[PDB]
Symmetry: D2
Subunit: 505 residues, 4 copies
């Protein structure tokens, strides 16, 4: 038996009888490729491509990265209605409510549940924060500057799963049989095999070096708010909270830079400087099939993850700077744990998570574990917990996402009142900020990162929005600066990425 | 400040005043390189090059890999005397006892102790098992078939340390000032900078793909012993042990294949099939400076590791197959822990380690920890402990190595009597088998793997030797088969490596 | 300084200025007394006396036991109104709502918060299950056979705290200054000192032996329900639950024996046979000041405990028999943990506890810890968790008790619907069964046990009521038998206690 | 079946056929007795009686205490020869080496190995430190002031085991059949039953109160050494150690008080003030059968414990005062753990224990566990480890004791050189100091405490000897004071015990 043995026609036939999506796979040895080099080869920065990587706690890359090698097709929204970009067949849900359209698409395109990597195919993309407008009634005071759709999800059928442990890549070409009929079976197989052959040959190409140097210039950028305007918004919210309007609210503002630097170069600097449990680079296509814009992020927190029937969330709140150093690091931990206020803030969000999940999980299954423990990241440590529940009968991964959306850590507690306050105090619509980036795979799983520490790159401009939680005793300047600094991590990376050069050049 | 900023001449001068070795370094971003691809670029399978990688427990690659980019020069042994291959200056110790020669070389070439990767430069290579002949009196019954020198250590001055976490490579060109005088300082700097520039440009080159497929054919190979001859040697040793000659002894035999496959290709298959905490590929040069032979291994166990004054060992003994699966896996662990015999065998080796270290560590510092706990590897689990001691005043990393040499896990308990028995029952001299591969870095640290699960590749022939511990109740056939199977892991990898082809070719 | 130094008049004066209750204490060495022997000496089975002991997990007695040495006075209820038995002064709250009467009594008689044992004085007694009728509207179908008051709490001012670790007894005579005025200070001191002197001299007396033997005869007793009647009640409740009326409900029935055996003798057999974290013996006085009845119990579970501002509960649900033995014991634990149904039942009660406490604790302080872990008791093991919260501003220990009352483990989930169902299916009012026995100390703390595994002993009759949780898949006979057996533990103890004799007599 | 059911004649007969010692037992309920009260009743301070109690870490009394109710007979030493006090039959080993005499006695009187408490019968008493003179050659410079025998062990055949958990006492009358013949079986039974009946009736008696008060006067006492003499001995030993004569040595001196206070009263004050894992009170008889002297102690450390074939030791070294308080307590622990010197001292003693046990345990069974962890006692914390080994084939509990004797913690490392130094610097023979008190039970187990924090009380005088470990950097005054203070704990207790009075008397 050969390593790169492709799925047999015989086996594909059997699978095609059972489900409307059949992955056809081929594993190769790729010990001289990294996720990035493989992306370069397989995707080449093309519209509808992506790379997803993961460094738990910003320390140690996990086993898998996933590359999208060209999705001709994406489900999105235009003038409040669900529409596909690129061509799909007659049976693909279109028009109307986009969430319902997405719900039916996922009901139709489920697969078996084998051996496959965690993500081998599915709907991959984002939900804007402003998708929440369709789940909760909110005022419409802030202006929609960026004009992004509520969602856009690639139908990602050609996927390369890079296994860092084995040094292998598993190539997947999924046959999508929308109409569910017996017809075209053998055609579907050969088509899938041909897409495998394309990815394979792309992997067969040589590559020039990107071995490089860069410096870290301070970026020049535009802010929506001065220290004064921001500090006063914070004081307003501190007043609301003291009165009992909410326990906590997460205001933000937008910053911007003009730049023509490739998105991947920004990804490269983020990966080196702020590795995180959710790294992503996504080229979002337009109706014409060129790149409308690019999303580059390194996010520290998932909204939700769904796996084998269970939805899980990881509320994160409470911060100290990592120690400079080792004795100081432990003082700081004992201090965060002893900070009763922050303990309380964290617990509020843990309860909010319990409730969110309560909406779609079977009663008596929603539990908290590893409650309020410490996690170290590259530059800071936090309190963290796990909330996990069994998806209720007939509930879906998408129900888990909508039930949790948006993260309490990006809105507040209680959530609606906090969103309301956010809308009162913020100049523009958030767009992707506080939304999610992630996937819904055909087997029923899902993983979404909160869209923070992220740049959206459009027509010569890069937007980076950042914020931070406000509580009873928050100080306006302190919050302004903490927020700006979060943003500068990304802005700094863009400025760095612009200096990328071959060493001694 | 630029990422690839090279060490300044000004700083080098100061360092040169203080020590006879001064590393000159340059860090680059190399997010599209793997250790293997970097090796290909920097070393290109040349004589005197190496790659060292590490996967703890065969699961999760550690942060660092180290590439040797061409050592013009190596300390070894010819006709019982210490000699350099390639050219060294007048002050480099030569002739006589090779251990003393190595001892003085290390005393001379120490560095400061900064920021550097774990290995940034030093003496890198092997000690044959038969080096033990110079530390203990042994009979000379077995024939020296392979004729390897007791040691050979590259003077590895051009090193690339690959950081998987940051995606960076730190290039080091060490200036070796043997004579210790003030002269040539500025020349030394420019020379080091030029070696950096060579490695840099080598990294700047493109590379063809090695994306590949392979199959796993059963190899045809030669064995020194039949099941009958081997089973009877085991029964002999079981008799000695029952009488109280020793508690345990580790006999082995040699297997061989003819093959012309590149060594790196064998490394590639080992890396995929049997990842381990010590992977190595080493091209050992001759006096002419071509490759005399190649060592390729994936070893599960260190002899000793020395770091910031402390020597540490990790005795490993007791085995079960990993579970097939998860419930079975736990039964097996409860079983190994409950196996009083194997507990005893493990404890014997732990005590042997305590004593070995007692020879060179300050009294009242040699401790055992994490005693006799379980570790899972890809295919098996073992009992494992830690023995660690403070190196006694005026003792060196090399004293730690010789004090421990050879591993009890490859000889037995008590060690000399076991070696004696090994010599009575084995046909040929072990050569590298049961020796070590590793390094002694200029800062005083050291890390050596036991040389097992290793192929030595010379003039169209690949040698793989394997064995296993014999105790009171060992069965001859069982031990024959367990030993042969250990060997076949490597032999299988050579046969696989021969099928390596571009997919669909 | 003498060990038995009594509090000084000078110090009492200062304390009397600050609070309406001033404990006057004297510590003695009592290394030849047990809690029982001390009780015999100090209380002698008199009306208004009690003994409280604690064996955590039924294994290892805790440090403290507490003896009440004659409370002349108790707050209780007659014809729905709050009344004192024995004489109290004009300022002591009487008439009306008994809970309000108890609330004001505790507000009045608070102390400082020193050095004192956990309980040094306070209101000590019970709340009937049927006290719940004043916090929730319930139907009145079942007949009130036993006619107990909703509550009765001794004003326990003479207390002996027995310290098993030191072998000492700390005697406390609390001066209760209801009117709050400066008058009678020096009189109060001498009175307290005289009560100390009485307890002291009582401790000074000799004692006859109770060294003893006993056998374990099967008791003859009366049951309210046959296996058929009980099994059918269980099936009824299983039907309600399947329909979604509740998740769980805890029906019980009453058993009875005629006996004239002293209550302490029953306590003695319980202590030997079913030691528990809450042992109690209480002699409840009547208006005439003789014993109306006696309560003897060994309870496995607290309702709530309040200490230094925090209320804590320990939901317990999920059972296996302890192992017979040690390998079997671990199988059983792995099994209980793996029992998803019982996990769910336990989680329901944990959530119910979170909510109960939510009613009186500051938001963002009610947390779960040590979630759903195993505890071993003498004969069974359970799942157990901790729910703890900060009492909200201006909330009291009594608010914690009422907020939790009655235990979900004795009612069900959700609680009211379960109580409703209990009332539909049960013949008589529960009385003390499912109520609590415990104390509210003057410093603000509280500890109450659920009143189960308890005998109420009145006019030649002993009542023991027992029950068990019903869920979706409960079997009628199994529940009948499990319930009866719980009861027989107490009934067996009464029958044993009747055989108590000096050995060979 | 009755609780106090005595062993049947039928069962005794069967047992008598199998072993020369047959315990005849009767369990009673004794919930109004403490170990002390039971001792008073059963032993009444008579010669040849004892009480043994245990408080692990000086916190929480363990389950069992053991009372010896009159041993008519003891194996001891007079003019270097083994002799019995009181009458024994012809077959009882006498004359000669006392250790051999004790060895054969134990070989003869073994029992089965059931249900019994940990100690139900055996040889109970002490070994003097100076017993070591028969296992190692030592100089004879110091004068033998106290003139104690090398050993004296009661043949303790009437034992009461007090179970604090159950509140029960298990009475044991062991039938000792020295001659091993069939004769007198039925006589032996009735005799044992009569001894049970005596203990039973003694338990049946009443008792007066000992409820009491006491003060803590500073005792006036005699010391062998001034601060100057002691500080200079310490400096001498510091010099020897610096030169490498030993790593550590434990000098001591003797203190004395005249007092006529009962020994039990001293025990009572020790029990309250310095509870420990080994409490003992022993009345040592003379040849006339009156009390020769009394031993009262509270020891923190076992020499060795032997149980079901395994010998175990618990080396203790490294000290801090407990924290005053809770934050300070943790600083102190982090500090002791970080004290590399004390770590080393502790490790030396751990190794010494490994070796001691190596002399009598099967190779490959002697292990260390729970290495060098912290234990809190009432006033101090220490580092502590466990060393445990399997007794070698044909080795006995007594071999374990002699192999370990005396504790390294009371001698030093290496042990002989330390003893030698002790003998050079100490005025008198140690006697019991640094010896052991404990038992060897008939089933093969053993438990011995190091004889420290102990008073020996003879003819109106109480001796208390104390010392402490000397190392490289010890200070003379500091050690003098630490030693004196250890002694004063006992001396203070004697002075306290003299004030014992009924409260207000
Ligand atoms: C590291 C632990 C083991 O591996 C070996 C022990 C001894 C010899 C060998 C060998 O490969 O020759 C080996 O793999 C083992 O099988 O116990």
């Amino acid at each position: 038996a050969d390593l790169a043995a492709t799925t047999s026609r015989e086996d594909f036939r059997l699978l095609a009888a059972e489900h409307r999506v059949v992955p056809v796979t081929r594993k190769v040895l790729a010990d001289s490729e990294t996720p990035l080099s493989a992306y370069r080869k397989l995707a080449a920065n093309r519209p509808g491509t992506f790379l997803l990587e993961s460094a738990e706690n910003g320390r140690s890359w996990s086993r898998w990265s996933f590359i999208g090698a060209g999705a001709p097709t994406a489900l999105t929204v235009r003038e409040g209605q669900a529409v596909w970009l690129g061509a799909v067949p007659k049976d693909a849900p279109t028009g109307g409510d986009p969430l319902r359209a997405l719900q039916v698409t996922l009901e139709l395109l489920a697969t078996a549940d084998p051996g496959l990597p965690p993500l081998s195919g599915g709907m991959v993309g984002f939900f804007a924060y402003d998708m929440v407008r369709r789940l909760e009634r909110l005022p419409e005071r802030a202006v929609d500057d960026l004009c992004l759709p509520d969602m856009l999800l690639l139908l990602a059928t050609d996927v390369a799963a890079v296994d860092h442990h084995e040094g292998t890549i598993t190539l997947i070409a999924n046959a999508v049989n929308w109409n569910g009929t017996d017809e075209r079976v053998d055609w579907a197989y050969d088509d899938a095999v041909a897409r495998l052959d394309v990815m394979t040959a792309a992997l067969g190409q040589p590559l020039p070096s990107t071995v490089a140097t860069f410096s870290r210039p301070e970026p020049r950028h535009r802010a929506q708010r001065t220290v004064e305007e921001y500090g006063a918004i914070v004081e307003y919210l501190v007043d609301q909270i003291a009165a009992g309007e909410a326990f906590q609210v997460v205001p933000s503002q937008r910053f911007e830079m003009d730049t023509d630097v490739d998105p991947i170069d920004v990804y490269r600097i983020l990966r080196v400087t702020n590795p995180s449990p959710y790294m992503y680079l996504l080229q979002v296509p337009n109706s014409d099939g060129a790149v409308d814009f690019s999303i580059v992020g390194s996010s520290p927190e998932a909204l939700v993850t769904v796996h084998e029937g269970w939805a899980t969330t990881h509320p994160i709140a409470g911060t100290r700077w990592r120690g400079r150093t080792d004795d100081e690091d432990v003082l700081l931990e004992k201090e965060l744990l002893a900070d009763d206020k922050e303990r309380a803030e964290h617990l509020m969000l843990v309860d909010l998570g319990r409730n969110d999940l309560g909406r779609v999980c079977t009663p008596g299954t929603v539990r908290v574990e590893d409650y309020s423990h410490i996690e170290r990241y590259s530059h800071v440590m936090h309190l963290v917990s796990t909330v996990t529940g069994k998806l209720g009968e007939g509930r879906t991964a998408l129900d888990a996402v909508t039930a949790c959306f948006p993260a309490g850590t990006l809105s507040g507690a209680p959530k609606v009142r906090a969103m309301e306050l956010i809308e009162e105090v913020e100049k523009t619509r958030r767009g992707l900020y506080g939304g999610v980036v992630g996937y819904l795979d055909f087997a029923g799983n899902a993983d979404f990162a909160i869209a923070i520490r992220t740049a959206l790159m459009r027509n010569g401009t890069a937007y980076v929005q950042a914020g931070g939680g406000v509580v009873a005793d928050s100080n306006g300047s302190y919050e302004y600066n903490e927020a700006r600094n979060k943003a500068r991590a990304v802005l700094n990376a863009i400025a760095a990425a612009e200096t990328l050069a071959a060493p001694g050049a």
